[PDB]
Amino acid sequence: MTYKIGVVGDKDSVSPFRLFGFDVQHGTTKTEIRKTIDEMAKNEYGVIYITEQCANLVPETIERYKGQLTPAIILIPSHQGTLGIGLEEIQNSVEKAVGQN
């Protein structure tokens, strides 16, 4: 089954993904980013890579899709690094699985 790849992040960091046929967008606000993610998920994107700085603004949107097969919303650093969110989220899935909250 064949799916597109999206990327949401700052131009400096995510522009090279355009060379690979990834759909690269660059929102700065909660609203912009949320709308981008919903549009990708409406267009059957398999994966969305999203820089942590962008992801930091839309936790509610990201949590909505977490239980869905696609899209897989994957946080990545920017050239300035991470906010630690991807890592914390791995710990959150553990706490969910083992029933610790």
Partner: protein, 188 residues
């Protein structure tokens, strides 16, 4: 309050109590598999955060010297047209994705080897950085999503195990007793 109804309810009770024990076994197995996958999830994410950030930094440094209009033209010439195949795999009662890159197959005989016209070593090398991260980025996507879906399924399974144990089974047992005492008063 009949013998026919008692019979039906008894099958439901043994199905529910056997099913409760086996659902707990399933909960345990999901957990075992989840824990292994979570280690991999962590391993992959640490590797990716490190290599991705390095690649991005190299690109930023590389592009800093060359004109913007040049970079814009370079980026508008595709190196590949990657899509992803996603197939559904069952891990017991949860569907999870198996992900694989699909590349342009008409270009098999001429595989990727990046060199842009009037570019430089540093700039091309930074593009090679991204090309190299691609398989591990897909790997992380598949492993992280699977862990996310498994966590959700284990929570669902845990809820059902408790509901069976503390609601369904005692309710069935109680009804079986009511049916029983009523039948046994009749013949006496």
């Amino acid at each position: 309050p009949t013998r026919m109804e008692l019979t039906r309810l008894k099958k439901q009770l043994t199905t529910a109590t056997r099913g409760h024990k086996l659902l707990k076994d399933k909960q345990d197995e999901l957990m075992r598999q989840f824990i292994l996958l979570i280690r991999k999830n962590n391993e992959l994410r640490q590797a990716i955060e490190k290599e991705t950030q390095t690649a991005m930094k190299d690109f930023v440094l590389a592009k800093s010297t060359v004109e913007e209009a040049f970079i814009d033209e370079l980026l508008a010439l595709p190196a590949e047209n990657v899509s992803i195949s996603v197939v559904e795999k069952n891990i017991m009662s949860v569907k999870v994705p198996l992900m694989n890159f699909q590349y342009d197959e008409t270009l098999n005989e001429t595989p990727l080897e990046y060199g842009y016209l009037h570019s430089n070593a540093e700039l091309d090398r930074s593009i090679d950085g991204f090309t190299q991260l691609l398989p591990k980025l897909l790997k992380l996507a598949e492993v992280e999503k699977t862990c996310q879906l498994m966590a959700e399924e284990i929570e669902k399974t845990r809820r059902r195990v408790n509901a069976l144990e503390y609601m369904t089974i005692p309710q069935l047992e109680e009804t079986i007793y009511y049916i029983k005492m009523k039948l046994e008063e009749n013949e006496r």
